[PDB]
Amino acid sequence: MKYILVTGGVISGIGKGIIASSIGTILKSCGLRVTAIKIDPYINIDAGTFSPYEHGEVFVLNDGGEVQVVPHITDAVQEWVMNQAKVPVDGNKEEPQICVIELGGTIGDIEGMPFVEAFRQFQFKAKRENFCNIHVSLVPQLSATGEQKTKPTQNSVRALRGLGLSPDLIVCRSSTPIEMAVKEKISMFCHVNPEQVICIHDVSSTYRVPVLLEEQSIVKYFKERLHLP
Amino acid sequence: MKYILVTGGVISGIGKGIIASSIGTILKSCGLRVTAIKIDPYINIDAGTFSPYEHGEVFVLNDGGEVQVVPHITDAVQEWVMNQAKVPVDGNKEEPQICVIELGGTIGDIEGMPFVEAFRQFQFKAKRENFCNIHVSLVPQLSATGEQKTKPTQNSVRALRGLGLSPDLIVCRSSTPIEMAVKEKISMFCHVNPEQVICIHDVSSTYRVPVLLEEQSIVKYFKERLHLP
Amino acid sequence: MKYILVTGGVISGIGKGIIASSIGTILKSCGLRVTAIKIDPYININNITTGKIYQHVINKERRGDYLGKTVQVVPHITDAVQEWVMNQAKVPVDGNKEEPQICVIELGGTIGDIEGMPFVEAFRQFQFKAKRENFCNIHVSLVPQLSATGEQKTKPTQNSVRALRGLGLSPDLIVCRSSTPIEMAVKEKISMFCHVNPEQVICIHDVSSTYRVPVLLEEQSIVKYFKERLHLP
Amino acid sequence: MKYILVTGGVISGIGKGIIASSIGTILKSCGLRVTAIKIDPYININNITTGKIYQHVINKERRGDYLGKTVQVVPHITDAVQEWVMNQAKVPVDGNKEEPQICVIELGGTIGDIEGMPFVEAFRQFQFKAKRENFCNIHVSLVPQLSATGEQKTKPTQNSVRALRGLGLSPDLIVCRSSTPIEMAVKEKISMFCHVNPEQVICIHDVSSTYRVPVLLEEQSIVKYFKERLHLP
Ligand SMILES: Nc1ncnc2c1ncn2[C@@H]1O[C@H](COP(=O)(O)OP(=O)(O)O)[C@@H](O)[C@H]1O
Numbered sequence: 001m002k003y004i005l006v007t008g009g010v011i012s013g014i015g016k017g018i019i020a021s022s023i024g025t026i027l028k029s030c031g032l033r034v035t036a037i038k039i040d041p042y043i044n045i046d047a048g049t050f051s052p053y054e055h056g057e058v059f060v061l062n063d064g065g066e067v068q069v070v071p072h073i074t075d076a077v078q079e080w081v082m083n084q085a086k087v088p089v090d091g092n093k094e095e096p097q098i099c100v101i102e103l104g105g106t107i108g109d110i111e112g113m114p115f116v117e118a119f120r121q122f123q124f125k126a127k128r129e130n131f132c133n134i135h136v137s138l139v140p141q142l143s144a145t146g147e148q149k150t151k152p153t154q155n156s157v158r159a160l161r162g163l164g165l166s167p168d169l170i171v172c173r174s175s176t177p178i179e180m181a182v183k184e185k186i187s188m189f190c191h192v193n194p195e196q197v198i199c200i201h202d203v204s205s206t207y208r209v210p211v212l213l214e215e216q217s218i219v220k221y222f223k224e225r226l227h228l229p
Numbered sequence: 230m231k232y233i234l235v236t237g238g239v240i241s242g243i244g245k246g247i248i249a250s251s252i253g254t255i256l257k258s259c260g261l262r263v264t265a266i267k268i269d270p271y272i273n274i275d276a277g278t279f280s281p282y283e284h285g286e287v288f289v290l291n292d293g294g295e296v297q298v299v300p301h302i303t304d305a306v307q308e309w310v311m312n313q314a315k316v317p318v319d320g321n322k323e324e325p326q327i328c329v330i331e332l333g334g335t336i337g338d339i340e341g342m343p344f345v346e347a348f349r350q351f352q353f354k355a356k357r358e359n360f361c362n363i364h365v366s367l368v369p370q371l372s373a374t375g376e377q378k379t380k381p382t383q384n385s386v387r388a389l390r391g392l393g394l395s396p397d398l399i400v401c402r403s404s405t406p407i408e409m410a411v412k413e414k415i416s417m418f419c420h421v422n423p424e425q426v427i428c429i430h431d432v433s434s435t436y437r438v439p440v441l442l443e444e445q446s447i448v449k450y451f452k453e454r455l456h457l458p
Numbered sequence: 459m460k461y462i463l464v465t466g467g468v469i470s471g472i473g474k475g476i477i478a479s480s481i482g483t484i485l486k487s488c489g490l491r492v493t494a495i496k497i498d499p500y501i502n503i504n505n506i507t508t509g510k511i512y513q514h515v516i517n518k519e520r521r522g523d524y525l526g527k528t529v530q531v532v533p534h535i536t537d538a539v540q541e542w543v544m545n546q547a548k549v550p551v552d553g554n555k556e557e558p559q560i561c562v563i564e565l566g567g568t569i570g571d572i573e574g575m576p577f578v579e580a581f582r583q584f585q586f587k588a589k590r591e592n593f594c595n596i597h598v599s600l601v602p603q604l605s606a607t608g609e610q611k612t613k614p615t616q617n618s619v620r621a622l623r624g625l626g627l628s629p630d631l632i633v634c635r636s637s638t639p640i641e642m643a644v645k646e647k648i649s650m651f652c653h654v655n656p657e658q659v660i661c662i663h664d665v666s667s668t669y670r671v672p673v674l675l676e677e678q679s680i681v682k683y684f685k686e687r688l689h690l691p
Numbered sequence: 692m693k694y695i696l697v698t699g700g701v702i703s704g705i706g707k708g709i710i711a712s713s714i715g716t717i718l719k720s721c722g723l724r725v726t727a728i729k730i731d732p733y734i735n736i737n738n739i740t741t742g743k744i745y746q747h748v749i750n751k752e753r754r755g756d757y758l759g760k761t762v763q764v765v766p767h768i769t770d771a772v773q774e775w776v777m778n779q780a781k782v783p784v785d786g787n788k789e790e791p792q793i794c795v796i797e798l799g800g801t802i803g804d805i806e807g808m809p810f811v812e813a814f815r816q817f818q819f820k821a822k823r824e825n826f827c828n829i830h831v832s833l834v835p836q837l838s839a840t841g842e843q844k845t846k847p848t849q850n851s852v853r854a855l856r857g858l859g860l861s862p863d864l865i866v867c868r869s870s871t872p873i874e875m876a877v878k879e880k881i882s883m884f885c886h887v888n889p890e891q892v893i894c895i896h897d898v899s900s901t902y903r904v905p906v907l908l909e910e911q912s913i914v915k916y917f918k919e920r921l922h923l924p
């Protein structure tokens with residue numbers, strides 16, 4: 001089993017699903033058996049025991065936006081990912097070759113930490129030749145100046161590295177297309193090679209996203225990086 | 230209703246309970262009606278939805294160390310604190326005058342954040358003449374050197390201020406007693422007056438703790454600070 | 459002297475200068491003697507820079523002003539910054555012979571960056587020396603928005619405000635900068651998730667002329683705020 | 692050149708010097724040419740200081756080396772730090788005429804303090820220039836213990852390790868310093884809550900003579916570790 005983990009930076013609604021979706025379609029296009037899974041961290045659940053001087057303890061919980069109960073979430077994530085990845089999908093009746101994992105929330109979210117920890121551990125179980133990750137981050141731009149900015153993505157990538165994952169591709173999302181100078185800064189200040197910086201701007205129909213990925217040699221990259229046929 | 234909130238710094242098992250307990254006893258000694266309440270944040274509950282490609286969503290939870298369910302924990306904390314504080318205690322049949330609130334966990338704990346937020350908001354509802362807080366922090370000391378350190382407490386106090394509470398007294402806990410130079414540094418680098426730094430070292434029976442507080446003029450302080458009889 | 463400190467978040471080119479400038483313009487039109495100090499965190503040598511302040515303290519140390527003692531960023535640089543601000547803020551301006559009543563300090567850089575920390579630390583400490591009613595700070599931060607969705611996002615400002623708080627300053631006003639006007643749902647979300655009242659969230663969108671910035675600031679009662687917060691005549 | 696960076700956490704006087712020194716002593720006894728660089732974050736002027744490095748770059752700027760450009764802490768100070776480390780690390784020592792194989796860099800200060808950040812940032816970047824097998828970093832941190840309870844606590848080391856990670860370095864060894872020996876329950880808790888294998892948690896308690904420190908380090912297989920981690924002969 002090969003795995004591609006997709007995470008998000010700086011903001012939510014950054015395009016995690018579309019990137020995972022698109023990577024799925026691209027590889028199926030080359031005749032690979034590909035499965036998708038999503039892990040969505042739940043809006044944090046805040047609890048506590050309240051204790052009056054001389055009367056019973058009330059235990060207060062907190063509604064989220066609204067079922068298995070495990071001892072260790074971290075072990076449960078890695079067991080459930082490994083097992084679902086095997087479940088045959090589409091037709092094809094056989095074990096998938098690539099599993100595209102979609103991690104909801106944004107890197108830096110308090111609620112995401114246990115799941116990022118899960119995958120930090122997992123990358124060493126999977127071994128490097130069968131596991132890579134892709135960080136989808138924002139490059140903002142105010143209309144008043146036109147200047148696209150790399151700082152938010154710089155910081156996001158550092159947060160990600162801090163939590164133990166090194167991004168194999170950085171997907172830079174932006175309103176208008178990214179100019180070579182800014183693409184050069186991302187490469188240089190996030191310490192990845194130029195080819196690992198993929199730029200996907202806002203497009204008028206989703207179909208264009210896979211096309212842009214392919215135009216930026218994503219398949220050649222995944223081929224070397226995961227040893228794919 | 231007057232309120233004294235007790236929080237902890239740098240480490241757990243810092244002596245929050247003993248300080249709250251001792252403050253309770255001291256004020257009762259002056260004939261005040263005093264009640265105690267404890268809020269203990271629960272070991273964080275990590276959840277998430279897992280989603281296979283073409284099969285039902287499993288929702289995974291996480292055991293803590295093991296009941297009311299509210300929309301906003303922050304509002305629930307402040308309502309429950311205000312109401313319990315009124316409940317007559319000991320004999321005395323009448324509404325307590327002072328409520329000593331004990332906040333479990335340590336400032337900086339992810340799980341403590343909503344409750345510290347609760348009290349940030351609460352200090353403005355209670356108004357300043359009826360609300361103060363007391364931060365019980367560690368001053369460590371290695372046997373190899375003997376040198377007591379203020380940095381952990383400096384940082385703890387900054388974290389506390391960052392979350393919106395300014396400590397009215399800093400209670401410095403340590404293995405051996407604190408020397409004047411270190412007591413001077415705490416005062417100066419945590420930006421409180423000398424009299425707001427109270428030092429309570431490790432003692433051989435709990436009874437000594439209230440005595441040390443009184444020796445360091447805690448009652449004179451609470452008198453001016455809360456307008457007590 | 460009363461002091462207003464303008465810092466920026468998330469990105470450079472966020473509008474620190476225009477805000478610093480507009481607050482100045484607004485306050486002068488209510489009859490107040492306003493002065494301006496600019497801090498540039500760069501090393502090149504009423505305007506202070508890392509170069510100038512470090513060269514000053516290095517030179518002092520080098521000729522023995524500190525009597526052999528160990529000289530450190532905190533407190534020696536940070537003392538020099540505070541001593542430098544207080545002395546500049548007193549210098550008469552705009553033709554007046556009397557001491558300025560207010561000093562708007564513009565701190566270049568973006569909060570979170572290493573170059574700016576000596577200055578943020580200087581001001582963390584300075585707010586305790588000044589009374590509360592003689593110092594406040596304003597944080598100018600990005601509310602970004604992809605055209606694909608049109609959703610304004612508050613997370614970057616949340617993380618920026620939390621980092622500022624981390625470094626010891628708590629913003630009295632959060633000026634949210636966006637391409638298009640911030641709507642009330644998003645404006646309340648900033649109030650909620652940063653930890654401030656609604657009236658402390660000031661929204662300043664991209665305008666077609668910068669004279670509109672002080673118009674927008676006055677429209678959101680910034681003078682009422684500063685009167686109460688700094689006790690101004 | 693291979694580099695080992697020693698940093699400290701929670702408190703000063705935590706043992707950075709003894710660890711830096713003991714690693715050096717241990718590695719020399721396995722036949723390796725070891726050199727030492729000390730960084731002092733103070734401003735006073737193979738030993739570098741904030742004063743020296745800032746004075747150097749200020750002077751360069753002042754005479755026009757950077758051709759009018761804006762000079763900044765990052766990259767100009769941080770470049771100078773990295774250029775300075777590489778050049779010192781090459782200089783022959785201990786009587787040998789050949790280039791040293793390993794350089795132990797001792798960074799004074801405590802992680803989290805402003806004075807140390809230019810240096811931590813220099814090394815965050817430097818670890819990408821060097822190969823992975825030519826750079827690792829060791830973090831010396833406090834496991835405190837009140838006599839009242841006798842409970843060793845890991846939270847301070849957790850927060851310290853997370854702050855180091857925040858500044859862009861991830862410790863390859865956490866050296867936990869305590870008054871009395873750390874027991875296995877607490878040793879596993881550090882492995883768990885910081886995010887590292889058990890063999891990366893090295894415990895060094897207060898001893899009655901500092902020669903015991905390298906004895907304890909070798910007892911916990913630090914050489915085995917460095918052989919694998921830095922690919923050493
Ligand atoms: N490159 C793009 N161009 C235009 N719209 C996009 C692009 N990428 C994503 N979107 C749209 O933006 C929204 C957010 O995308 P989604 O994949 O759901 O993000 P996330 O998975 O991070 O929530 C969706 O409506 C999606 O169709």
Ligand SMILES: Nc1ncnc2c1ncn2[C@@H]1O[C@H](COP(=O)(O)OP(=O)(O)O)[C@@H](O)[C@H]1O
Binds near residue numbers: 433
């Ligand atoms: N000053 C002191 N001297 C000796 N023992 C103390 C002192 N303060 C607290 N203790 C003891 O240390 C332990 C922790 O105290 P506790 O109040 O339960 O801390 P917390 O409320 O922060 O958990 C208890 O066993 C308590 O009796």
Ligand SMILES: Nc1ncnc2c1ncn2[C@@H]1O[C@H](COP(=O)(O)OP(=O)(O)O)[C@@H](O)[C@H]1O
Binds near residue numbers: 668
């Ligand atoms: N609200 C706004 N609308 C349009 N343009 C703006 C606005 N605020 C700032 N600008 C412009 O953006 C650029 C950057 O502003 P500036 O104040 O120089 O930012 P900073 O001081 O943060 O670097 C300038 O051209 C400025 O006139």
Ligand SMILES: Nc1ncnc2c1ncn2[C@@H]1O[C@H](COP(=O)(O)OP(=O)(O)O)[C@@H](O)[C@H]1O
Binds near residue numbers: 699708895
């Ligand atoms: N494991 C230890 N046992 C006893 N004393 C120690 C130990 N480690 C360091 N020390 C002593 O503690 C003091 C501080 O050590 P040092 O290495 O100078 O700390 P730093 O370099 O972090 O300032 C010195 O007197 C040193 O000999």
